[model samples]
Structure formats: structure tokens, C-alpha cells
Target: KDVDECSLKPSICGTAVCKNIPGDFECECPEGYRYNLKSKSCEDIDECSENMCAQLCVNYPGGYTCYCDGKKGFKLAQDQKSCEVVS
Candidate 1:
């Protein structure tokens, strides 16, 4: 199945912009974040150094995982190699 970025709310790195690529979503991090060439990942541009997630931010291939504590307020948006929280 094709991965849908929209289904995974707040999955992309920044609000700069997101363009759908062939197999994945390309994250254009806001001016404060830049794409890391070595890791091919997004890194904080360091102007103010802000962590995007409310709790824990787990970086994954092509996207990220926000670890929200048990409040029954969230659900997994995709089927990757991680354990998804079912609603």
C-alpha cells in the first residue's frame, strides 16, 4: 500500500512545506531547520532550537513518531515497523 502523508498528521518535519514524492513525502523544514546531507535527514537549523513534539520525538525513516503519554487522545496514522496505537 502507498504511504499517505496527510493521514499522518504532523508527521513531516516542519511547516515550511511538504511535497509528495514518488514513494514518500518530502519535508521542507521551516527556515529554522535544514536538511542534513550526511544522514539525509532533517536537523534543527539552530536559530532557536525547538523540539517539535509535545513529549518525545522519535525520528523514523521518511517521517517521525510523537510519543504521547496515555491519555487516549491519539492514534497511529501509518503502518510502519513500529507498534501502532489503535483507536
Candidate 2:
């Protein structure tokens, strides 16, 4: 009997969104996250490894932040990712 697995186990996705389909379900991870099949959970993706920021990249759960080196007289540009000169 095909049943609603999402309703049966709300925590099945383990921080990911659960979508029930025909005889199966899918776990949807949010932005900056990936669904780990082995762990059956949503894991944060390290955007910093991909060089998202020009100077500094702070990766956090579900998202990433970009920054510039202020000590080096650099500041984040208007785009928030590219580094620009302070003066």
C-alpha cells in the first residue's frame, strides 16, 4: 500500500525538506546545502573551497558570506564578493 512517507516520518529528511512522490520520496536540500545519501541528512556545502569570495569566504550552515581583508586596506565591493581598495 502506497502511503505518505513524509507524514509517517517528519524527521526523515534530517533538516532537509521532504517531498513525497509516487511510491517514493525525495529529500530537498536548501541553498548552500547538499543531501547526503549515506547520512540521509542535509550537509552544508563549502563555497569557500570554490573561491566564492575574492579575499575571504566565510562558509556557514545553509549559506556563505564574502569578506575583504580590512587589515590590508581592502574592503568588500558593492557586489559583496569582489575585494576593492579602501581608498
Candidate 3:
């Protein structure tokens, strides 16, 4: 009888990136996935909520993008956090 690691340690994986080999199992955290011991889980960090972009911040699955308002002809500055008005 083989004791599968999947059922034994279900929480070992957050992105379900698990593999079983011989008599052992392996787990890998996906990109942009952060794990916390307090919560005992992995969660996505909200860059938009952290004031990442000056004008507008859009979030993707594993990343984020910053954009400036079209009305003001704004553009992302060198800092990547603030927006600059283009004349």
C-alpha cells in the first residue's frame, strides 16, 4: 500500500503544483504567489491597493501594470509609481 502525499499533505500546495515520485512528493509555489505561515496559505498581493500607480493601476494574474489618464495625457514616470503629464 502506497500512502499518497497528495491526501496526506493537501495544504502543501497552493497552486496545485505537486508531483509524486518513487516514495516522495514535491511542491512548488507558482510565480507571484506568496505564502504566509500565520495564514498557512498562499495569496495574491494586491498592487493596486498599495498605491502602486499614480493614476491607474491594473492587476493581472501574476503581475500588474501602471497607466496614466488619457484626458491629461499622462504617462508613467521613471519611478514607475507616479504619473507625469505630457505637454
- Which candidate leads in TM-score? 2
Give the whole-model CA lDDT for all candidates, comma-separated.
0.45, 0.62, 0.56
Per-residue lDDT of candidate 1, residues 1-87 (tens digit): 355542333334443355544444445764335454345567644321234444344654435555543455554345422233555
Q: How would you encode candidate 3's per-residue C-alpha lDDT over 4-50 as one tens digit per residue?
A: 64344333343255564555444454544443445657665455655
RMSD in angstroms, all models?
11.6, 9.3, 11.0
Backbone clash pairs for candidate 2 read none
What's the candidate order when arranged by decreasing lDDT? 2, 3, 1
Displacement of the residue 39 alpha carbon in candidate 2, Å: 3.5
- In angstroms, how far off is 35's CA in candidate 1? 5.2
My TM-score estimates for the predictions, one after another, are: 0.24, 0.50, 0.40
Which residue pairs in model 1 clash with each other? none
Q: How many steric overlaps does candidate 1 have?
A: 0
Q: Could you tell me which residue pairs clash in candidate 3?
A: none
lDDT at 87, model 1? 52
Candidate 1 stretches with Cα past 4 Å from truth are 1-50, 69-87
